[PDB]
Amino acid sequence: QREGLALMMQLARELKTLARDLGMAVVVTNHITRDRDSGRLKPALGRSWSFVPSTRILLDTIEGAGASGGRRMACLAKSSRQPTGFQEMVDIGTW
DNA sequence: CCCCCCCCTATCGAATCCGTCTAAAGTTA
């Protein structure tokens, strides 16, 4: 089908125009998928949605030692003002 | 041309000896 992709593009356009033409701060959350041929982590909703946002934040859980709790991984996957690929450690149980 | 997942199985293979105790009964000038 095609109507779902068109609806997704229309929603993306509405969000972008609400953010820019009005001067607002919009934050959205998305799921994460595992690629089949390469086996690398990849954002969901496909390539068409891949171009929508401007700043990307990826959250992962630290396996093995330090697992569970708030201890997790925060990374920057896309930005228009910073180089990507950087690493950072954050917690979600100290606030 | 577009976007997301699946699943346990099956037994094997014997070794290694030790440590002594308890005496009894006279006979024939």
Side-chain angles (χ1 to χ4, degrees), chain A residues 13-71:
Chain A
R13 289 286 313 157
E14 191 276 333
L15 292 174
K16 286 144 64 63
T17 194
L18 183 51
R20 180 48 54 99
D21 286 350
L22 194 60
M24 190 178 288
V26 295
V27 193
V28 297
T29 82
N30 195 36
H31 293 169
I32 186 77
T33 60
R34 160 79 68 190
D35 206 344
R36 197 54 67 180
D37 53 355
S38 74
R40 302 150 45 86
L41 275 300
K42 193 178 72 70
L45 261 59
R47 304 185 185 85
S48 308
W49 174 262
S50 75
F51 305 112
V52 175
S54 66
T55 61
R56 281 184 184 268
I57 305 168
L58 197 146
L59 302 186
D60 195 357
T61 59
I62 296 166
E63 60 88 20
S68 83
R71 187 83 272 168

Side-chain angles (χ1 to χ4, degrees), chain A residues 61-91:
Chain A
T61 59
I62 296 166
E63 60 88 20
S68 83
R71 187 83 272 168
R72 265 160 186 87
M73 186 276 286
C75 170
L76 199 75
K78 174 197 178 78
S79 193
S80 180
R81 60 188 38 98
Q82 297 194 34
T84 60
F86 289 165
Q87 191 39 271
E88 213 280 332
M89 297 297 106
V90 71
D91 44 5

